[PDB]
């Protein structure tokens, strides 16, 4: 726990109602329970936020005197402000129901309790309407078998199933074929939250079919691409041992019994710098060391390939992972690259792209005197069969990948002036070289399956299964954080759209206005954020596009023009630098060094017609419909033009469906089961709406009876007697002497505030 987790977490603290610990009589209820921020239990653990104490009988009022039960105290009183002390849930069992809006007092220690006593029970999935809560146990639990999805999948009553991943799974499929609408499945959280896992466990539980009476040629290729999918696109990282450097999303067609008909898939924003650099005790992507260590002997000589610990681009003294098979993995991936149709040549093909990539980061440039210069770059005389067999591996032409790398061409006035490139500007393309092979492999791979496992004439009504981080917020958040965020403020948009949606149709439905129902939109912060011309992306791309760009300038531009907007705000400490997006779970700071030189990054020129040249199909294929535009720089070969295109796409698509919501949490840094953090768990209740997903669930008329529960309630029907019912609730709620803002009467049901609905048990 960093103290900058501390300092977070008590941003997120907030009390709301009042502890009503005294009688009628104003003495202390019988051993009343409340929750304090005040605690030295508190102040000695990290963990520790919040501390359960029983109010002592004879209490004054305005200054409570607790005794701390759990963690287990001295036993010793101590004052307490009231402002201090939040409602307990005591006498209800976390166990008994899955749902948080049951609770009577939803405040943050009465939620952060409901879960953690869950979790340390092994109940890790919990509702929040319409969210399903998972938090990642660290170990197998069981649950999600085969005997489990036949219970979810053949259960009638779906009421009487705890919640689950696949309460998401059988909801979203029963409404799609119930009335043909499309259905997406958002699956969101940190990294180590297991996203992955979620749905790994979504994907199984469609594929299991009731009759096996339909054909899975398609469904064994959708299934095996997970162990692809990873070996390309997952890494190694500090927080995660199989962490997914891409969003993923996929659009399937399942069959009602069961059964994956039709699939297909889109990867964005893979970590391009993983392939060429990692941090320490963090590994490239998993097909690397999977291959060169799996790979057999034939292989091993026929592409000549070292050791795991004598590659550039792979980190030496992090190529083993504890609890990983890498060979055990690679024979895993070979069968599946089988199993999405692609022959022993494809296959070979495939391998030799990787073999390439890798042996052309072997290769050693050194700076020559050469064309009346001293700083002509040059590959290293010892390296020249190196990158011979780089190129020959590739299927690439070594004199013109040579000439793409070390010469450079001004193309000024018509007139073609030749001239060469510096050590490390040739450093750059051979590096952005190994980058686009390598993306531009995994998306031919992903391309091919599409092909593969694509309905003919497209999709109709779908199932959008979309995995993406949660709201980054770290000390330094770059451009990647800045897409992440973007791509979440969207999906906000649909979160509260499709609770207002559901709401407003109750109302509508019983005869209740809407008037009230309200709920602000975050189409500031998105504007802020994509709108052309009056944006921090269109600031971005101009400055890409501006010859004399700097990241300064860019931060400057932004500061300039979207001074108009509440939502942009310069930060206080390197403001040249630095800037602040006012996001809907706050305020998050970016540093906007480096944001040109990412945003740029993507191989363009005669490199890639040199590839597009190349006599394998399948390397021709990797580039294939390209803007080509040599000199210079085009918005077409821009990132963050091409992820906004990507996105609105996406969300065009997201926008005609009904989602879905599954919210990861990571309980601990240290991989171990039932460990609780509670300011980690914290950030992530608030980063993932959990919080505001109850907030809004209890806003206006919540307190939901009909008529005859009203009168169960009152002690002393519906078919025979309903507006006989309906004016014995109208007599009582203006008996009780209550507001007519706090009670609507409706066509069966009595709608009460939460507040009001207070006062009547009173």
């Not at 009688?23 to 202390?28: C, E």
């Not at 403020?489 to 109302?507: A, C, H, P, T």
């Not at 919501?661 to 309980?667: A, E, G, L, S």
Request: charge should be neutral; proline fraction near 3%; include cysteine.
């Amino acid at each position: 726990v960093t103290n900058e987790e501390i300092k977070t977490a008590s941003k997120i603290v907030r009390r709301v109602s009042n502890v009503e610990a005294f009688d009628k009589s104003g003495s202390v209820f019988k051993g009343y329970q409340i929750w304090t921020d005040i605690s030295p239990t508190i102040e000695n653990d990290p963990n520790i936020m919040f501390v359960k104490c029983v109010v002592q009988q004879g209490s004054k009022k305005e200054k409570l005197t607790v005794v701390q039960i759990d963690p287990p105290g001295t036993g010793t009183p101590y004052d307490i402000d009231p402002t201090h002390a939040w409602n307990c849930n005591s006498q209800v069992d976390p166990m008994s129901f899955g749902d948080i809006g049951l609770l009577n007092h939803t405040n943050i220690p009465c939620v952060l309790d409901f879960l953690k006593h869950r979790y340390l029970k092994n109940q890790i999935y919990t509702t929040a309407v319409p969210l399903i809560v998972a938090i990642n146990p660290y170990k197998d639990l069981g649950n999600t078998t085969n005997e489990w999805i036949r219970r979810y999948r053949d259960t009638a009553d779906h009421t009487k199933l705890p919640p689950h991943v696949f309460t998401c799974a059988r909801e979203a499929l029963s409404n799609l074929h119930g009335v043909n609408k499309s259905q997406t499945i958002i699956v969101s959280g940190e990294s180590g939250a297991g996203k992955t896992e979620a749905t790994k466990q979504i994907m199984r539980y469609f594929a299991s079919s009731k009759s096996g009476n339909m054909d899975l040629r398609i469904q064994t290729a959708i299934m095996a691409a997970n162990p692809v999918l990873e070996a390309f696109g997952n890494a190694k990282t500090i927080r995660n041992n199989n962490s997914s450097r891409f969003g993923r999303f996929m659009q399937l067609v399942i069959s009602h019994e069961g059964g994956i008909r039709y699939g297909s898939v889109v990867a964005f924003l893979l970590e391009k710098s993983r392939i060429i650099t990692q941090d320490d005790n963090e590994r490239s992507y998993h097909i690397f060391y999977q291959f060169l260590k799996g790979a057999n002997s034939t292989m091993k000589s026929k592409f000549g390939l070292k050791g795991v610990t004598e590659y550039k681009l792979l980190n030496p003294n992090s190529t083993e992972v504890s609890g990983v098979d890498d060979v055990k993995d690679f024979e895993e991936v070979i069968e599946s690259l089988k199993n999405m149709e692609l022959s022993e040549s494809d296959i070979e093909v495939i391998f030799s792209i990787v073999a390439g990539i890798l042996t052309l980061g072997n290769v050693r440039l050194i700076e020559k005197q050469e064309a009346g210069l001293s700083d002509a770059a040059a590959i290293m005389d010892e390296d020249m069969g190196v990158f011979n067999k780089a190129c020959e591996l590739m299927y690439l032409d070594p004199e013109l990948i040579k000439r793409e790398i070390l010469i450079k061409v001004t193309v000024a006035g018509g007139t073609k002036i030749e001239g060469r490139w510096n050590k490390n500007d040739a450093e750059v393309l051979k590096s952005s070289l190994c980058k686009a092979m390598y993306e531009k492999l995994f998306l031919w791979i992903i391309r091919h399956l599409n092909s593969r496992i694509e309905p003919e004439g497209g999709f109709k009504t779908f199932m959008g299964m979309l995995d993406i981080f949660g709201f980054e917020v770290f000390k330094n958040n770059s451009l990647e954080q800045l897409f992440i965020n973007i791509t979440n403020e969207m999906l906000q948009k649909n979160f509260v759209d499709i609770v207002f949606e559901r709401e407003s149709k109750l109302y509508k439905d019983e005869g209740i206005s809407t008037a009230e129902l309200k709920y602000t939109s975050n189409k500031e912060v998105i504007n802020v954020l994509c709108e052309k011309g009056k944006s921090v992306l269109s600031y971005l791309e101009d400055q890409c596009l501006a010859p004399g760009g700097t990241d300064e300038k860019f931060v400057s531009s932004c500061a300039t023009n979207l001074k108009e907007n509440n939502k942009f705000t310069p930060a206080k400490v390197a403001s040249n630098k630095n800037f602040i997006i006012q996001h809907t779970i706050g305020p998050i700071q970016y540093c906007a060094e480096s944001f040109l030189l990412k945003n740029k990054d993507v191989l363009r020129g005669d490199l890639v017609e040199v590839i597009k040249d190349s006599p394998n199909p399948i390397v021709q294929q990797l580039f294939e419909g390209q803007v080509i535009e040599k000199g210079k720089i085009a918005k077409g070969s821009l990132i963050g033009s091409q992820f906004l295109n990507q996105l609105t796409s996406l969300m065009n698509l997201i926008n005609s469906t009904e989602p879905h919501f599954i919210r990861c949490i990571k309980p601990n840094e240290n991989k171990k089961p039932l460990e609780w953090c509670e300011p980690k768990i914290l950030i992530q209740l608030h980063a993932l709406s959990i919080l505001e997903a109850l907030v809004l669930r209890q806003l206006g008329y919540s307190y939901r009876r009909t008529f005859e529960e009203f009168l169960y309630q009152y002690k002393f029907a519906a078919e025979d007697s309903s507006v006989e019912n309906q004016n014995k609730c109208v007599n009582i709620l203006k008996l009780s002497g209550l507001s007519e803002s706090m009670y609507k009467i409706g066509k069966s049901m009595v709608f009460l505030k939460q507040e009001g609905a207070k006062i009547l048990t009173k």
